[PDB]
Amino acid sequence: KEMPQPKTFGELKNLPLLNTDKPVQALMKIADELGEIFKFEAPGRVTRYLSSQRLIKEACDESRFDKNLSQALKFVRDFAGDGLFTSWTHEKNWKKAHNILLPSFSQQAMKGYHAMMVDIAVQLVQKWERLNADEHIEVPEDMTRLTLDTIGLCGFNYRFNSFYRDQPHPFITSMVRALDEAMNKLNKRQFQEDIKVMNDLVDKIIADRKASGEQSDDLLTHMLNGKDPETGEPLDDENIRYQIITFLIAGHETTSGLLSFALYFLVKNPHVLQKAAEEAARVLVDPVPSYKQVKQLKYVGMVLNEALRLWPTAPAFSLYAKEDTVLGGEYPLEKGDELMVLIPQLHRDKTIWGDDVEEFRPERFENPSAIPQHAFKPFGNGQRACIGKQFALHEATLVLGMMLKHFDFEDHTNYELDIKETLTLKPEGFVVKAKSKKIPL
C-alpha cells in the first residue's frame, strides 16, 4: 500500500532521473527495480508510473480515468492547438472533431486512401530499386520520408516530394524543428517562425480548396464536408488546420518508427523474415498491391503487432482520476491525480505474455482475441485511443509487404539497437542493404 519511489534529489525530487537522453528506457529500468507502480515527482508535479496489466486495466476504465494533457502535450499544443491529440475530452472541439472524423478513419475508409498510399509506397520501393551496388539504406530516414509524404497526400492532397530532396520541404523542416523545440522544453524566435511556416502553408491549402471547390479523396475534403451529428456544426477553418498539423505530428514518426523496428526485428530473425517474405510473395501477385491484398497479409500484420509489443513507438500516455478512487484495492487516489501508462513495460508483463517477453515471436498474435483486454495498448485507450490506428496499420502492412516482396535485406553492419527518444521511439542509425529480386513494380 506504500508506493515505491526512485532516488530523490532534494527539492528537485526525481526530476534529475529524466534529465537523460533516454527517459522511457530509464523509466523501464526503474519499473524493473520497483515493480508495477511507482511514484514520480518533480517540483510542479506528482505522477504514478503503471507497468502491470492488472493495474493498467483499471487505469483504462473510462468511468474512473480520462486522458490527461501531459506537459509534452501542452507544449505540442502551441502548434497542434485544439486538434484531437492535444484536446481535453470535455472540450467542445474534441467531441466535434472526434464525431466528424471517426468514420473517415475507419478500416472501411482505408479503401479510399489506398491509392495515394500506394503512390508513395511505390516511390519508396523505386528509390531502393535505383540504388547502386555500393549503397545502403538509412531506414528510419526513408520511413519518415514515406510517412510524411503519405499523410500529406492522404491528409490534404499536398506533395512534400520528400523523395526528390536532400533538404526536406520547408514545412517539414519547421514542423520537425517545432516538435523538437517542444520536446526540448521538458529558440523562441525560431519556434514562432516555424509555427508560422506551418499555419501559413496549411491555411493556404485550405483557403485554396474552398476557393476551387474540388472534391478529393483526402481528409481535408471530408472535413470541409463534415457536420457533427450532435451540434450540426462543421469544423471551422482554424480547427481543420490544427487537425492537419496534428495528423502529421501524431502520425509521421510513430508509424515510421514502427516500420523501422519491424524491419530491424526481421533482419535480426531471418526465419521470421523468410516466413513474412513468403507470405508477401504469395499474396502480392500484382505489380500494384490492392486494398484486399494488404488485408490478406496476416503474418506481416502479426510482425507489426509484435514490433509494437516490444517498442510501441508512442510509449507513454497520461491519465487523471475523474473522482476519488482506489487503484487495485491498494492505492488511494484523489480526483485529478495523474497516472502514466508505461506501455513497453505493460507489453513485458510476464503474467500475460509468458517468460519469453524479450523474444520477437509474431506467432503470439496468431489469434488476436486470445489476448486479454488491455494487455496490448500501442494505440492508447478507449475513446482517446489513436484515431489513426487503421491508417497506420494499413500503411505499414502495405509498405512492409512491398519491401519484403521486392528485396532481400542484409544487416551489413550487424546493427546494434540504439533507441532514440523524442515524442516517439526509433532505432537511430539503423541501416541495411537491399538486393532487388527484380520483380515488376
Ligand code: HEM
Ligand atoms: C503505429 C503508429 C501510431 C501509434 C503507435 C500511435 C499511437 C497513439 C497513441 C498511444 C495515442 C493516444 C495518446 C494519448 O493517450 O495521450 C494516439 C492518439 C492519436 N493519434 Fe496515433 N499513433 C500512430 C499513428 C497515427 C497516425 C498515422 C495518425 C494520423 C493519421 C495518428 C493520429 C492520432 C490522433 C489524431 C490521436 C488523438 C486521438 C484522440 O484523442 O481523439 N496516429 N496515437
